[PDB]
Amino acid sequence: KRNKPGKATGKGKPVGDKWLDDAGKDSGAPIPDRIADKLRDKEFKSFDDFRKAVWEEVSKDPELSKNLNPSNKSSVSKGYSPFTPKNQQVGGRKVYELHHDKPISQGGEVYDMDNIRVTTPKRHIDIHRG
């Protein structure tokens, strides 16, 4: 289902400067409302294509991008996920990861931004653990 086309939906939430700090805690950080406004109703061939669009929009957003350093700004400008702080990295997983709150395996929506969270590798592994 991650590789079937869908249009992006949902509202997201207001965020601040600590947006990506929240990705290491609880259920992760929300998709920002400002990002949801840009991506709603666009069609994506796959979830990977959506992921790329998220980071490109972050690169272009003057409130979200200001809290990334020059090297991380370069990364998001390419549509790559930015690098997390070292202690949130796990092996070769060193960048922020998108997470579905209601699992896709359980009929969770792939492209509904209200069902998506931004996580660090460490937090993402821990959420799925059980």
Partner: protein
């Protein structure tokens, strides 16, 4: 050629750091490979933070990063760059 710091001249190492800082790759995978390589080369306890999460006061230009690495290795009993 790229097995250790001592295999790189300072100029060659600056080229590597510049490529990383500019995300001058064809994929996210390629960039992650380069950052991992940097971490393994420098042996600096901060790892990727030298590039992405600089300590207050540190110069996070490519030149600044190279000098932070060079100074740390010099102060901590490690071998230096080639020439």
């Amino acid at each position: 050629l790229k097995h250790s710091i001592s295999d790189y001249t300072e100029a060659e190492f600056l080229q590597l750091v510049t490529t990383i800082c500019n995300a001058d790759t064809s994929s996210e995978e390629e960039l992650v490979k380069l950052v991992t390589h940097f971490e393994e080369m420098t042996e600096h306890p901060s790892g990727s933070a030298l590039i992405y999460y600089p300590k207050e006061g540190d110069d996070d230009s490519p030149s600044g990063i190279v000098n932070t690495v060079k100074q740390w290795r010099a102060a901590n009993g490690k071998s230096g760059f080639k020439q």
